[PDB]
Coordinates of C-alpha atoms and ligand atoms in Angstrom, one line a residue:
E1 CA -41.0 29.4 -1.7
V2 CA -39.0 26.8 -3.7
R3 CA -35.4 27.8 -3.9
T4 CA -32.6 26.2 -5.9
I5 CA -29.0 26.8 -6.8
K6 CA -26.9 25.3 -9.6
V7 CA -23.8 23.3 -8.4
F8 CA -21.5 20.8 -10.0
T9 CA -20.7 17.4 -8.8
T10 CA -17.5 15.5 -9.5
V11 CA -15.3 12.6 -8.6
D12 CA -12.1 13.8 -10.2
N13 CA -12.4 17.6 -10.0
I14 CA -12.1 17.8 -13.8
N15 CA -15.3 16.3 -15.3
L16 CA -18.2 18.3 -13.9
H17 CA -21.8 17.3 -13.7
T18 CA -24.5 19.9 -13.6
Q19 CA -27.0 19.7 -10.7
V20 CA -29.9 21.7 -9.4
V21 CA -30.3 21.4 -5.6
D22 CA -33.2 22.3 -3.4
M23 CA -32.0 24.7 -0.7
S24 CA -34.5 23.1 1.8
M25 CA -32.7 19.7 1.7
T26 CA -29.3 18.7 2.8
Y27 CA -26.7 17.7 0.2
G28 CA -26.9 14.2 1.8
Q29 CA -30.6 13.9 1.0
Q30 CA -29.8 14.8 -2.6
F31 CA -26.4 13.3 -3.5
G32 CA -25.4 11.0 -0.7
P33 CA -22.1 11.8 1.0
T34 CA -20.9 15.2 -0.3
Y35 CA -17.7 17.1 0.2
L36 CA -16.6 20.7 -0.5
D37 CA -12.8 20.9 -0.8
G38 CA -12.5 18.1 1.7
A39 CA -15.1 19.3 4.2
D40 CA -18.0 17.0 4.7
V41 CA -21.2 18.9 3.8
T42 CA -23.6 15.9 3.8
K43 CA -25.6 17.2 6.7
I44 CA -25.5 20.8 5.5
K45 CA -28.2 22.6 3.4
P46 CA -27.1 24.5 0.3
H47 CA -26.0 28.1 0.9
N48 CA -26.2 31.0 -1.6
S49 CA -22.4 31.1 -1.7
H50 CA -22.4 27.5 -3.0
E51 CA -23.8 28.4 -6.4
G52 CA -21.4 27.4 -9.2
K53 CA -19.1 25.5 -6.9
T54 CA -17.9 21.9 -7.3
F55 CA -18.7 19.2 -4.8
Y56 CA -17.2 15.8 -4.6
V57 CA -19.6 12.9 -4.4
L58 CA -19.3 9.1 -4.3
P59 CA -19.5 7.2 -7.5
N60 CA -23.1 6.2 -7.4
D61 CA -23.8 5.7 -11.2
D62 CA -21.9 4.1 -14.0
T63 CA -20.6 7.4 -15.4
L64 CA -19.0 8.4 -12.1
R65 CA -17.7 4.8 -11.5
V66 CA -15.8 4.9 -14.8
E67 CA -14.5 8.5 -14.2
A68 CA -13.4 7.5 -10.7
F69 CA -11.6 4.4 -11.7
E70 CA -9.9 6.0 -14.7
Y71 CA -8.6 8.8 -12.4
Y72 CA -7.6 6.9 -9.3
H73 CA -7.2 3.2 -10.4
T74 CA -9.1 1.9 -7.4
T75 CA -12.6 0.6 -6.8
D76 CA -12.3 0.6 -3.0
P77 CA -15.8 2.0 -1.9
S78 CA -14.3 4.0 0.9
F79 CA -11.5 5.6 -1.1
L80 CA -13.0 9.0 -1.9
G81 CA -14.3 9.5 1.6
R82 CA -10.8 8.7 3.0
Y83 CA -9.2 11.1 0.5
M84 CA -11.6 13.9 1.4
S85 CA -11.2 13.3 5.1
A86 CA -7.4 13.5 4.8
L87 CA -7.5 16.5 2.4
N88 CA -9.5 18.5 4.9
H89 CA -6.4 18.2 7.2
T90 CA -3.6 18.3 4.7
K91 CA -4.8 21.5 3.1
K92 CA -4.0 23.1 6.4
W93 CA -0.4 21.8 6.6
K94 CA 2.5 24.0 5.5
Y95 CA 4.8 22.9 2.7
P96 CA 8.1 24.8 3.0
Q97 CA 10.8 24.6 0.3
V98 CA 13.9 23.2 2.0
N99 CA 17.1 23.1 0.1
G100 CA 15.1 23.3 -3.1
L101 CA 12.6 20.5 -2.3
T102 CA 9.0 20.5 -1.1
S103 CA 8.9 19.4 2.5
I104 CA 6.2 19.4 5.1
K105 CA 6.1 21.2 8.4
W106 CA 5.7 18.7 11.2
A107 CA 2.0 18.0 12.2
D108 CA -0.2 15.0 12.9
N109 CA 2.7 12.4 12.9
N110 CA 3.4 13.3 9.3
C111 CA 7.2 12.9 9.4
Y112 CA 7.0 9.6 7.4
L113 CA 5.2 11.5 4.7
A114 CA 7.7 14.3 4.6
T115 CA 10.6 11.9 4.1
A116 CA 8.7 10.0 1.5
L117 CA 7.9 13.2 -0.4
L118 CA 11.5 14.4 -0.2
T119 CA 12.7 11.0 -1.5
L120 CA 10.4 11.0 -4.5
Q121 CA 11.8 14.3 -5.6
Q122 CA 15.3 12.7 -5.8
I123 CA 14.5 9.5 -7.7
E124 CA 13.2 8.9 -11.2
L125 CA 9.6 7.6 -10.9
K126 CA 6.4 8.2 -12.9
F127 CA 3.0 7.4 -11.5
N128 CA 0.3 5.6 -13.4
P129 CA -3.0 7.0 -11.9
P130 CA -3.8 10.5 -13.3
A131 CA -4.7 11.5 -9.8
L132 CA -1.1 10.9 -8.6
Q133 CA 0.4 12.3 -11.8
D134 CA -1.6 15.6 -11.3
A135 CA -1.1 15.9 -7.6
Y136 CA 2.6 15.1 -7.7
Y137 CA 3.1 17.7 -10.3
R138 CA 1.5 20.2 -7.9
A139 CA 3.5 18.9 -5.0
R140 CA 6.8 19.5 -6.8
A141 CA 5.6 23.0 -7.4
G142 CA 4.9 23.4 -3.6
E143 CA 1.2 22.7 -3.3
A144 CA 1.4 19.2 -1.9
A145 CA -1.9 19.0 0.0
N146 CA -3.7 16.8 -2.6
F147 CA -0.7 14.5 -3.0
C148 CA -0.4 14.0 0.7
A149 CA -4.0 13.2 1.1
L150 CA -3.9 10.8 -1.8
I151 CA -0.9 9.0 -0.2
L152 CA -2.8 8.6 3.0
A153 CA -5.8 7.3 1.1
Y154 CA -3.9 4.8 -1.1
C155 CA -2.0 3.5 2.0
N156 CA -5.1 3.3 4.1
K157 CA -3.7 5.6 6.8
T158 CA -5.6 8.4 8.5
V159 CA -4.1 11.7 9.5
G160 CA -2.3 11.3 12.7
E161 CA -1.6 7.5 12.4
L162 CA 2.0 6.3 12.7
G163 CA 3.3 5.4 9.3
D164 CA 6.3 3.3 8.0
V165 CA 8.4 4.8 5.2
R166 CA 9.2 1.5 3.5
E167 CA 5.5 0.4 3.5
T168 CA 4.5 3.8 2.1
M169 CA 7.1 3.6 -0.7
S170 CA 5.9 0.1 -1.6
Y171 CA 2.3 1.5 -2.0
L172 CA 3.5 4.3 -4.2
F173 CA 5.8 2.0 -6.2
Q174 CA 2.8 -0.2 -6.8
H175 CA 1.1 2.7 -8.6
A176 CA 4.3 3.6 -10.6
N177 CA 5.6 2.3 -13.9
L178 CA 8.5 0.1 -12.9
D179 CA 7.8 -2.6 -15.5
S180 CA 11.3 -2.1 -17.0
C181 CA 13.1 -2.9 -13.7
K182 CA 14.7 -6.2 -13.3
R183 CA 16.9 -7.9 -10.6
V184 CA 18.8 -11.2 -10.8
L185 CA 20.0 -12.8 -7.5
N186 CA 22.0 -15.9 -6.7
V187 CA 21.6 -17.8 -3.5
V188 CA 24.5 -20.1 -2.4
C189 CA 24.2 -22.8 0.3
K190 CA 27.1 -25.3 0.8
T191 CA 24.7 -28.2 1.3
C192 CA 22.1 -27.4 -1.4
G193 CA 24.3 -25.7 -4.0
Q194 CA 23.0 -22.7 -5.9
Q195 CA 19.7 -21.2 -6.9
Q196 CA 19.2 -18.0 -9.0
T197 CA 16.1 -15.8 -8.9
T198 CA 14.8 -13.0 -11.1
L199 CA 12.6 -10.2 -9.7
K200 CA 10.6 -7.6 -11.6
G201 CA 8.8 -4.4 -10.9
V202 CA 8.6 -3.2 -7.3
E203 CA 10.3 -6.3 -6.0
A204 CA 13.3 -5.5 -8.3
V205 CA 14.0 -2.2 -6.6
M206 CA 13.3 -3.0 -2.9
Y207 CA 15.3 -5.1 -0.6
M208 CA 14.9 -5.8 3.1
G209 CA 17.8 -7.0 5.2
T210 CA 20.8 -4.7 4.6
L211 CA 21.2 -0.9 4.0
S212 CA 24.4 -1.2 2.0
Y213 CA 24.2 -1.5 -1.8
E214 CA 27.8 -2.6 -1.9
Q215 CA 27.3 -5.4 0.6
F216 CA 24.3 -6.6 -1.4
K217 CA 26.7 -6.9 -4.3
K218 CA 29.2 -8.8 -2.3
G219 CA 26.8 -11.1 -0.4
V220 CA 24.6 -11.4 2.6
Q221 CA 23.9 -14.3 4.9
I222 CA 20.4 -15.7 5.1
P223 CA 18.9 -18.9 6.5
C224 CA 18.4 -21.9 4.3
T225 CA 15.9 -24.8 4.6
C226 CA 18.5 -27.2 5.9
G227 CA 19.5 -24.9 8.9
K228 CA 22.7 -23.8 7.2
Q229 CA 23.4 -20.1 6.4
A230 CA 23.5 -19.4 2.7
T231 CA 24.8 -16.4 0.9
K232 CA 22.8 -14.1 -1.5
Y233 CA 24.4 -11.6 -3.8
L234 CA 23.3 -9.3 -6.7
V235 CA 23.9 -10.7 -10.1
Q236 CA 22.2 -8.0 -12.3
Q237 CA 20.3 -4.8 -11.8
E238 CA 18.3 -2.7 -14.3
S239 CA 16.6 0.2 -12.7
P240 CA 17.0 4.0 -12.2
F241 CA 17.3 3.6 -8.4
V242 CA 17.4 1.0 -5.7
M243 CA 16.0 1.1 -2.2
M244 CA 17.8 -0.8 0.6
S245 CA 16.0 -1.2 3.9
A246 CA 16.6 -2.8 7.3
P247 CA 15.4 -2.6 10.9
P248 CA 16.7 0.7 12.3
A249 CA 20.3 0.4 13.3
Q250 CA 23.3 2.7 13.9
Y251 CA 24.7 3.3 10.5
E252 CA 27.3 5.7 9.0
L253 CA 26.3 7.7 5.9
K254 CA 29.2 9.0 3.8
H255 CA 28.9 12.0 1.4
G256 CA 28.7 11.0 -2.2
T257 CA 28.0 7.3 -1.7
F258 CA 24.1 7.4 -1.8
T259 CA 21.3 9.6 -2.8
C260 CA 19.1 10.0 0.3
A261 CA 18.1 8.0 3.4
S262 CA 15.6 7.8 6.1
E263 CA 16.5 8.0 9.9
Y264 CA 14.1 6.6 12.5
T265 CA 14.4 7.4 16.2
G266 CA 12.0 5.8 18.7
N267 CA 10.3 2.4 19.0
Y268 CA 7.7 0.4 17.3
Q269 CA 4.6 2.2 18.8
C270 CA 5.9 5.8 18.2
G271 CA 8.9 7.6 16.9
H272 CA 10.2 10.1 14.5
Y273 CA 11.7 10.0 10.9
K274 CA 14.2 12.4 9.5
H275 CA 15.5 12.6 5.9
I276 CA 19.2 12.8 5.0
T277 CA 20.2 13.9 1.5
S278 CA 23.7 13.8 0.0
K279 CA 24.2 17.1 -2.1
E280 CA 27.4 19.3 -1.9
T281 CA 27.4 18.1 1.7
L282 CA 25.0 16.0 3.9
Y283 CA 21.8 17.9 4.7
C284 CA 19.3 16.6 7.3
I285 CA 15.7 17.8 6.6
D286 CA 13.4 17.3 9.5
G287 CA 10.1 18.7 8.1
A288 CA 10.8 22.5 8.1
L289 CA 14.1 22.1 9.9
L290 CA 17.4 21.9 8.1
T291 CA 20.9 21.1 9.4
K292 CA 24.2 20.1 7.7
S293 CA 27.2 18.0 8.5
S294 CA 30.3 16.4 6.8
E295 CA 29.5 12.9 8.2
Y296 CA 26.3 11.3 9.5
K297 CA 25.8 8.4 12.0
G298 CA 22.3 7.5 13.2
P299 CA 19.6 4.9 13.2
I300 CA 19.1 4.5 9.5
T301 CA 16.2 2.4 8.1
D302 CA 16.1 3.1 4.3
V303 CA 18.8 4.2 1.9
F304 CA 18.3 5.1 -1.8
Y305 CA 21.0 4.8 -4.5
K306 CA 21.1 5.8 -8.1
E307 CA 21.4 3.0 -10.7
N308 CA 21.2 2.4 -14.4
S309 CA 22.6 -1.1 -15.2
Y310 CA 24.8 -3.2 -13.1
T311 CA 26.3 -6.7 -13.8
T312 CA 28.4 -8.6 -11.3
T313 CA 32.0 -9.8 -11.8
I314 CA 31.5 -12.7 -9.3
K315 CA 31.6 -16.1 -11.1
Ligands
A3X401 C1 -18.6 4.1 -4.0 O1 -17.3 4.6 -3.9 C2 -16.3 4.3 -4.8 C3 -16.5 3.7 -6.0 C4 -15.4 3.5 -6.9 C5 -15.6 2.9 -8.2 C6 -15.2 3.6 -9.5 N1 -16.2 1.7 -8.3 N2 -16.6 1.3 -9.5 C7 -16.8 -0.1 -9.7 N3 -16.7 -0.8 -8.6 S1 -17.2 -0.6 -11.2 C8 -14.2 3.9 -6.5 C9 -14.0 4.6 -5.3 C10 -15.0 4.8 -4.5 O2 -14.8 5.7 -3.4
CL402 CL1 -4.8 18.9 10.9
CL403 CL1 4.1 11.2 -12.2
CL404 CL1 25.5 12.5 13.2
ZN405 ZN1 20.9 -25.6 2.7

């Protein structure tokens, strides 16, 4: 007896493609690698319960290639498989609402993702790939599994792998519209004089070397090519936020002087992130866990600040 069912294939879970599959052959033999809501069904034969369901496949013809690029803005051949592999895990995570924000209950070393997600909900940022637009909208509403699996895929991290918050934000910023953001800096060495620089996009909102926005405005010491120490300060800033980052160090966070921050305890091979947010008071969100305090001191590694337009008074 020849038996078939109708299923749909997809690469973006919006555009569907009608298929008839032989129930005597695996999905793999018929589609190549195939996934059902993140589960790898390549080696599985069609079941009656599969009729009418949507399966993800890899882009193996020009129509799927165009749909996949339009939705994800990547042509990395292994992207969809990495996204499905992650999703199969993230759909099992819990996403509690903590002080009004979608968080993530700790699992699989996902603390860096929780503090990244919590941060995104506090800064003005629009993503460019539809995949991120759609999944972030769902994440804000509490259903963050697809958004987390996409972050993992875009950052080329697997579930359980140790992640860095600054690197993760850089990847997400790369897929955001930051074209309006601009930064002017001035570098002063006593032997070589001055040199001003202009930064755009992601580079205009990220800085590595100091956590304090005020000190960035007043000046920071860096090496110069002659062996002297030069000073660098912020001349002009046009952006809706800024992100200041540094190797983890004991740092004091004062209520009302920043938006949110990341705290890292541990070492370079393993550790743990927490998120600090400045609301009526300082709240520390550690996945599902919430505590409060009037003042905060701890090993901070990233601080986010609101911004619209800043121009220095320094001459
Ligand atoms: C085979 O797997 C993938 C293919 C692509 C697309 C759209 N490539 N298309 C061109 N290179 S023209 C994107 C992600 C994948 O996972
Ligand atoms: Cl898991
Ligand atoms: Cl968005
Ligand atoms: Cl403290
Ligand atoms: Zn010099």
